[PDB]
C-alpha cells in the first residue's frame, strides 16, 4: 500500500537523476533537435526534428509495477519545438499507457 511520502521520495530521486542526465549528456547534433527537459512528470531526452519521442513510465508512480511495458509520448516538430496543445504552450503528451 504505497504512501504519499514514499512516492514523494521516489519522485525527488527520479528528478535528481533526470537533472544529472540533462546536465551530463552531450549536446544535440543541431539546434533543430527539441530540447531535453524535465516536465515535473517525466524526463525527456532531446528529440530528432519531425519525430515522436518516447520514454518509459516514470518509475516513481505508485502503480509502476503494474505498467512495466508502458511508454509516454511527445512529438518533436521539424523546427525543434515540442508540439504544443492548442491555445496554450503546454506540450502535447500521450500518457495513456502509464495511467493506473
Amino acid at each position: 500500500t504505497v504512501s504519499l511520502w514514499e512516492t514523494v521520495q521516489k519522485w525527488r530521486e527520479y528528478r535528481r537523476q533526470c537533472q544529472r542526465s540533462l546536465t551530463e549528456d552531450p549536446p544535440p547534433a543541431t539546434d533543430l533537435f527539441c530540447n531535453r527537459t524535465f516536465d515535473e512528470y517525466a524526463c525527456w531526452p532531446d528529440g530528432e526534428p519531425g519525430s515522436f519521442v518516447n520514454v518509459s513510465c516514470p518509475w516513481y508512480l505508485p502503480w509502476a509495477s503494474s505498467v512495466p511495458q508502458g511508454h509516454v509520448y511527445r512529438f518533436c516538430t521539424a523546427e525543434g519545438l515540442w508540439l504544443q496543445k492548442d491555445n496554450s504552450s503546454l506540450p502535447w503528451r500521450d500518457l495513456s499507457e502509464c495511467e493506473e
Binding site: 500500500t1 504505497v2 504512501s3 504519499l4 514514499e6 512516492t7 514523494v8 519522485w11 516536465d39 515535473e40 512528470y41 508512480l61 505508485p62 503546454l90 500518457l95 493506473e100
Partner: peptide, 29 residues
C-alpha cells in the same frame, strides 16, 4: 468478506489517494 466493503479498505483507499493526487498534481501544470 466483500472486498472494498470494510473500514480497512476505506482507510487504505484514502492513503492511496494522497499519492495519486500528488501524481495528478505533477501531470497538471
Amino acid at each position: 468478506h466483500x472486498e472494498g466493503x470494510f473500514t480497512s479498505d476505506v482507510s487504505s483507499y484514502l492513503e492511496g489517494q494522497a499519492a495519486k493526487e500528488f501524481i495528478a498534481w505533477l501531470v497538471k501544470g
